[PDB]
Amino acid sequence: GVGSVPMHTDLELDFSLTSSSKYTYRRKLTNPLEEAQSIDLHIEIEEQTIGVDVHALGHWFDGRLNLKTSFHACTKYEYPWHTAKCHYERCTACGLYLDQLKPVGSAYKIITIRYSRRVCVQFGEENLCKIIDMNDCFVSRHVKVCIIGTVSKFSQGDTLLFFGPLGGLIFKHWCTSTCQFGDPGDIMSPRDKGFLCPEFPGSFRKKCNFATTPICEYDGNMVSGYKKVMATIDSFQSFNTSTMHFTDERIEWKDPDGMLRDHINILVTKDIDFDNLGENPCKIGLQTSSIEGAWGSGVGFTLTCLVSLTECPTFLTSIKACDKAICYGAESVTLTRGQNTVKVSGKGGHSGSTFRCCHGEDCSQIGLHAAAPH
């Protein structure tokens, strides 16, 4: 079933929830003080949504670095690879050029991140839902729901890579202005407008002599950035994606497998009116019997009420003297099963007042006029 919680103090829940998990909390909040009347609390927390503001960096490429050596007043010699989009050239000559260029993904620089969760709270007959974030607690009269923060493999300034079809890697270090071959992000096509070539910081070691024929020997890095990443893939954090929403300069999705957790704090105020707002399986009938005293300022009046309790042996509550949804007095009483006589002292009202015996929002059908104070 569902457990009960005597609200002797504020209830507080503090816990960590998996981003791809929902959470349900249900409890009967029973009256502190020696009464077992109770208000239902029902909380539903939905899966985490991830929203990121980004700058699109264009496509990352794989490729193969090739080195060709040529010997024959070098100037002007055109070589058949001068039509290569990325080539570097330094009697003999040496030529690096990039071949087998293939796109492997679209990359995006994170500007700002925001984790949301939808939260629904029912407290008694009140039900309210809100999408919350760390900068916006769920607030109601009796219940607060806060996200303290999230443990995340994503960060600001990080770069996200999407494999085709949109796989995914997190990079904490992405080349921006100067890219050397072998770096993450080394070969880029931003905007698709042009081709951004990497640099080759290595040196050419010209081996020169007779008969053996010369060889150009480049001593820099020969392995592309993409290959280096795949070769040490465990150094990088992968992610999977579901329920995507690619709005060009914003990406919102739900993480489908573990990965992130957040901290949830739930606080439920002790200050609760268990009358009016709460329930009791006890059924109470009220009727006015008689009245004495005066309306308005002075001695005041006393209303006698007949009060019936069923479905329990005793019930501690308050019986009130009210008129037209204004109350003028109340008496606390422990009722016994069957009929009870309760005298309630009150003050106030006017000549047109009909004072009824009342409990919560329920009042008897009969009410009485008190006498004039003159």
Epitope: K76, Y77, K85, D99, Q100
Partner: antibody, heavy 113, light 107 residues
């Protein structure tokens, strides 16, 4: 400035070995780095045969390799081409080009019998 | 093939032409464009990224994106009625391949 002119035998019988000659005039053949052969059959498109950018070794088209031999000599100062065992599909206009910027006016070769 | 063109393209005088060439090596290499008139040797028009030889009009332009490369002719004139061949390096990096050619008719 130089002007290229390629010459051949015109008409040859099948299986007979073909031999083209591209003469460089107005300068040396070593003045330009890289020389190329390319032919086109009548009514058809261009087909790259081979090129010599390198004093070390020439590039050849896979489909035409072995059958085709290309050379560069400085004594006669001319670009050389030799096709072995010629069929009725080798009949085409053979072009000589340096750096693929400057072209000779070509020479027709027909293979019939 | 591995370097495909459209066989024939027809243009009315004054209009703008776009001749496209598509191949796997075209994203590793800049295409070369050659213009051939009937009974004449091929003539280089474009190489690299929009670099072009002297004697060639301003209306010839170079274009590349993905595995395609395009030769654009803005404000076409009658003398442009010729063959156009797309030329690039092979993916192996050892061959030079031509396209199927494109017969441009000006009206």
């Amino acid at each position: 400035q130089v002007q290229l002119q390629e010459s051949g035998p015109g008409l040859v019988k099948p299986s007979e070995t073909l031999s083209l000659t591209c003469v460089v005039s107005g300068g040396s053949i070593s003045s330009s780095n890289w020389w190329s052969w390319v032919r086109q059959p009548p009514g058809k498109g261009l087909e790259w045969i081979g090129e010599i950018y390198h004093s070390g070794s020439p590039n050849y088209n896979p489909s035409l390799k072995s059958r085709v031999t290309i050379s560069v000599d400085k004594s006669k100062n001319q670009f050389s081409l030799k096709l072995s065992s010629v069929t009725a599909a080798d009949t085409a206009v053979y072009y000589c080009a340096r750096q693929m910027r400057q072209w000779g006016q070509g020479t027709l070769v027909t293979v019939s019998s | 093939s591995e370097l495909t063109q459209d066989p024939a393209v027809s243009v009315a005088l004054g209009q703008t032409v776009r001749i496209t060439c598509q191949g796997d090596s075209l994203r590793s290499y800049y295409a070369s464009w050659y213009q051939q008139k009937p009974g004449q040797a091929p003539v280089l028009v474009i190489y690299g990224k929009n670099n072009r030889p002297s004697g060639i009009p301003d209306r010839f332009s170079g274009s590349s994106s993905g595995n395609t490369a395009s030769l654009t002719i803005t404000g076409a004139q009658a003398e442009d009625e010729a063959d156009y061949y797309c030329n690039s390096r092979d993916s192996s990096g050892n061959h030079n391949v031509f396209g199927g050619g494109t017969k441009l008719t000006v009206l």
